[PDB]
Amino acid sequence: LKIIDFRLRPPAMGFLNARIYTRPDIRNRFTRQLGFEPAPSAEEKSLELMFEEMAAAGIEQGVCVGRNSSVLGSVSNADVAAVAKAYPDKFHPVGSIEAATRKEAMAQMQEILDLGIRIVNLEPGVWATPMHVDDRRLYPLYAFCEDNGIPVIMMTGGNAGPDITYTNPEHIDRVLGDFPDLTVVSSHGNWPWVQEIIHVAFRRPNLYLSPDMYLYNLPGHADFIQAANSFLADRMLFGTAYPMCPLKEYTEWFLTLPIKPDAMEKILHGNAERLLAQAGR
Amino acid sequence: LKIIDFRLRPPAMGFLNARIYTRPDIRNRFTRQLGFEPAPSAEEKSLELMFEEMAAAGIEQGVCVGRNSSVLGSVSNADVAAVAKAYPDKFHPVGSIEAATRKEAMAQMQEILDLGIRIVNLEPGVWATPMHVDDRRLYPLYAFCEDNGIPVIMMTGGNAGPDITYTNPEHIDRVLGDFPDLTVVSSHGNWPWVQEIIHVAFRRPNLYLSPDMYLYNLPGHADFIQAANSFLADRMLFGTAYPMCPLKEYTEWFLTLPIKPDAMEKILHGNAERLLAQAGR
Amino acid sequence: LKIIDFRLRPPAMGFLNARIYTRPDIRNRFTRQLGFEPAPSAEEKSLELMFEEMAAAGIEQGVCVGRNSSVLGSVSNADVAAVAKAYPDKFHPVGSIEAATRKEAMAQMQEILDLGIRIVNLEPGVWATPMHVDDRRLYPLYAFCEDNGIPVIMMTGGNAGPDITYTNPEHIDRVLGDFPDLTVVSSHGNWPWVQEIIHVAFRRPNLYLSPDMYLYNLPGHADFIQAANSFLADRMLFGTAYPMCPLKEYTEWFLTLPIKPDAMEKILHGNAERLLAQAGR
DSSP: OOEEESSBOOSSGGGGGSHHHHOHHHHHHHHHHHTOOOOHHHHTTOHHHHHHHHHHHTEEEEEEEOBOOSSTTOBOHHHHHHHHHHSTTTEEEEEEEOOSSHHHHHHHHHHHHHTTOOOEEEOGGGSSSOOOTTOGGGHHHHHHHHHTTOOEEEEOSSSOSSSGGGGOHHHHHHHHHHSTTOOEEEETTTTTOHHHHHHHHHHOTTEEEEOGGGGSSSTTHHHHHHHHTTTTTTSBOOOOOBTSSOHHHHHHHHTTSOOOHHHHHIIIIIHHHHHHHHHHO | OOOEEEEEOOSSGGGGGSHHHHOHHHHHHHHHHHTOOOOHHHHTTOHHHHHHHHHHHTOOEEEEEOOEETTTEEOOHHHHHHHHHHSTTTEEEEEEEOOSSHHHHHHHHHHHHHTTOOOEEEOGGGSSSOOOTTOGGGHHHHHHHHHTTOOEEEEOSSSOSSSGGGGOHHHHHHHHHHOTTOOEEEEGGGTTOHHHHHHHHHHOTTEEEEOGGGGTTSTTHHHHHHHHTTGGGGSBOOOOOBTSSOHHHHHHHHTTSOOOHHHHHIIIIIHHHHHHHHHTO | OOEEESSBOOSSGGGGGSHHHHOHHHHHHHHHHHTOOOOHHHHHTOHHHHHHHHHHHTEEEEEEEOOBOSSSOBOOHHHHHHHHHHSTTTEEEEEEEOOSSHHHHHHHHHHHHHTTOOOEEEOGGGSSSOOOTTOGGGHHHHHHHHHTTOOEEEEOSSSOSSSGGGGOTHHHHHHHHHSTTOOEEEEGGGTTOHHHHHHHHHHOTTEEEEOGGGGTTSTTHHHHHHHHTTTTGGGBOOOOOBTSSOHHHHHHHHHTSSOOHHHHHIIIIIHHHHHHHHHHO
């Protein structure tokens, strides 16, 4: 069974400078509140061990999302691209845009493209100056992405901003209605507003959902499964959010879920492959 | 079992002019995404066939809900009155309004009254000028309907407006708070905000819920059924939203639902008969 | 096995003046609508009968939340204090604040503490001038409470204000994020926004939930129980909202809920004991 993890941050090179690795104290309370044990690979910061766990889980590849902050938290687009160039058979790079002016944003897009990266990630709720995903300032970016067939990963669930308004489902819904041909992946699946986001995905045929860590024993779990077994078969994406969840435990739990066999295949790898193939252009 | 369907738009007269019938390609996509096959009578645009399916489903009467929408189609109130008077044993007419100003709204309300029609439907999120149901401009209309004991159907679930803010339960809650003696039916049951609408109904004793098609295999199903088995027994309405759902298949599915038998009877006919009594004044 | 009821308004003293006892007919709609019969001690307003029902239910103590409303009636802080000192093995007093001005609040907080009360309750949605719990004007109050280790109870669930925006989880989520070491108990558990408030409790470690009456056969019931059995075992508080619910029927139902024993004892008494220890300093 082929598995592609849509949120997987390796303990490798520039990623060891991220908060998920420099502050394991914070990451571990989160992993533990979810009901899991910290992966040994993440505890030890061992890429070697991570590869072993990937293998034992059945995960062939990963989608590596950074943070292009330029601050201490950062893992630059250059560094995500170095990781992918070092294990090209294992990690797909995603470029993140983190920008004050629209000129900076397009200078960063220029660099992302030149690095051979083709999927962009936006997390505007965690920027130095936070904004909502439907902020007027982000609209030139979406127009560019839509006109160029570029898929956009946007953080609209979990701790997507300084407070819960940053996951309110009105913000992504505005964006999808105003860019009806733009491919959007909501990372964390817009959790916890699951009732609402199922309706959004129902209405907005371009929206993919990746609940990741938040599918595990939390509100909305039933709703996601129910939708995966109907209209959302082709628009849901397996993901662990590793290192937040351990690879082996999470994947082997996901594999027992009451999802119909052809939808399982799409959620595990087919939907991702389709996304990646669209990006490649 | 007597059964009154609270949302039916038969393939007759003006109703054939609405996008529900003029774009069956769009409608049938929605019907199949929900998990149904299109009604043959709707495919054929045939009243004969519609009556036969109604009889085969065990549905005695239908509430013919007007629509006036500059995008979605317009069916005149004169036609809604004419369909009902041609089949007075089968059909209860509901008039609709599309207005940009309060006087435009009151003139249309008066036309509707003059035609013999005693209930009004409002779908302001799909008007020429889209508005929230708690728009200031609707308030003098609500005061009139409250003062005269006129029940009001309002669309505040599903695709009620350009984006998901037009289903946010804050809008219908304000109305009920400002017009505490007004009978309101929420068409589509304010879906997807299903945890919240049950609270609105708990608090506001004159709110009725008719989730219709959005009951089927979607989030909130369990919440609706639980309330139906409790305080909402008196205030939920069976409706199919035909031609979005086939009469026969929807009704048979509905009749297998775990809803206590005394509640099932009120929901299938008792609750609507009390509403139609009230509109009888 | 010891039960501490986190919300119990006994039929004595000043409490006899609240709208929960002066309007039995409103109360009783909420009670029967939930599915209970009114407690015989509430009907008669007999304290001695309440003590009988309390012991029959197994409840050892109750937290007496005073109301300082012009919308829901009044029991002054002196009265709450008098109930507790007349029944010191049975009642824990909670002080409430209703004020326009910062200086008015600070003087009420001074009297609360002079009366020997160590917990404060805030229900600003029901003041003569309703405000949200994150209104700028409450921030000085929260700052004092956080610096002084005083636990704050705030009503952010149920009929918390004029309309459902007064329970939107964005409001308590701001207060918890701006006062990360303030102990907050959400009375009514911010129902109906149960998917949302679970994420909020997940994210904000100082939040305690007390859904009380709203845990009964209503949406979010399973979201609450699921979190009680995991990360919220230490942060959930049993309570009946007596006289809104009968003590014996509610407690018997509650005791049979699928909650593991170590989590069950915390929710029944251990968490409330910890809060009371905190308030005792």
